[PDB]
Write a protein that binds this ligand. Structure first.
Ligand SMILES: Nc1ncnc2c1ncn2[C@@H]1O[C@H](COP(=O)(O)OP(N)(=O)O)[C@@H](O)[C@H]1O
Ligand SMILES: [Mg+2]
Lengths: 17, 269
């Protein structure tokens, strides 16, 4: 079942102007 | 330069991010304590450098009791230091797991503080993009403790309600639908993450969860969550109503920070 756990941050970028 | 090593004595371990080691430190001239977010710069591209200065710039713009204050930003030949006001109550994450969940009163009070902090960001033209319990720190350490919004490593500037494609960044379980759909987004993403947080506060597990990450994202995009008995039996309908407005898949229909701080469950006290 669902368990509250630490999740790492991600930044795959791809920002479009 | 050598400004940090000369003016600060590094101490103990406090926490870690994906690229950060945070340690307690003492300003030598005053004996005042701080938190030193240390970052190896030898490893970083020019983009990561610009993200680092961006974080510093945004933190400075923000002055609020429930937002971590930046005391100094120092560069050395191989490392960069962001000296913040120390907050010694640990991550909100640690407290939730220790207590399993919060009563509706503790949850309401806690989420109110979170909302006041993110509302501040939004009114100051900032979207955090990374609301989650491990980026929310507790002031007092135990009970009634003030919550402080931290980690602006992904925060960016937006003005008003206009939404654009600011890239694919955040934390899986907390990501909003519009980001995962690669649609233009804005401030409303923070409220989604708050809805996720509030849900976690009330029963101690996330509303969107799966072993397969692809499926998790499917779930998030479809706004596929529920309130399983018996956990949510004793929880008030109005509490659930607040969450539903926050976890509204369409951001233009999504409740704002401002009009969430009005909500009865938060304000009917
Ligand atoms: N001001 C602070 N006081 C005490 N501990 C702190 C702190 N700021 C950050 N920390 C701890 O260090 C961890 C990482 O800090 P963070 O600002 O999120 O770095 P990041 N962007 O790499 O994720 C936090 O999760 C927290 O546990
Ligand atoms: Mg963090």
């Amino acid at each position: 079942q669902a368990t509250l756990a630490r999740q790492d941050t991600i930044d795959e970028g791809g920002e479009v102007d | 330069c050598t400004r940090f090593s000369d003016n600060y004595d590094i101490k103990e371990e406090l926490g870690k991010g994906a690229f950060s080691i945070v340690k307690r430190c003492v300003q030598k001239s005053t004996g005042f304590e701080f938190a030193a977010k240390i970052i190896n710069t030898k490893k970083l591209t020019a983009r990561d450098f610009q993200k680092l200065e961006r974080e510093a710039r945004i933190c400075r713009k923000l002055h609020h009791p429930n937002i971590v204050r930046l005391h100094d930003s120092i560069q050395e030949e191989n490392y960069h230091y962001l000296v913040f006001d120390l907050v010694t109550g640990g991550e909100l994450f640690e407290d939730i797991v220790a207590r399993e969940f919060y009563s509706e009163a503790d949850a309401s009070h806690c989420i109110q503080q979170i909302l006041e902090s993110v509302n501040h960001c939004h009114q100051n033209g900032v979207v955090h993009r990374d609301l989650k319990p491990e980026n929310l720190l507790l002031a007092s350490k135990a009970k009634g403790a003030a919550v402080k919004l931290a980690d602006f490593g992904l925060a960016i500037e937006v003005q008003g309600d206009h939404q654009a494609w600011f890239g694919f960044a955040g934390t899986p379980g907390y990501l909003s639908p519009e980001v995962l759909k690669k649609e233009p987004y804005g401030k409303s993403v923070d409220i989604w993450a708050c809805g996720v947080i509030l849900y976690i506060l009330l029963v101690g597990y996330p509303p969107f969860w799966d072993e397969d990450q692809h499926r998790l994202y499917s779930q998030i995009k479809a706004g596929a969550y529920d309130y399983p008995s018996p956990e949510w039996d004793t929880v008030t309908p109005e509490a659930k109503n607040l969450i539903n407005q926050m976890l509204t898949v369409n951001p233009n229909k999504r409740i704002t920070a401002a009009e969430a701080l009005k909500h009865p469950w938060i304000c009917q006290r």
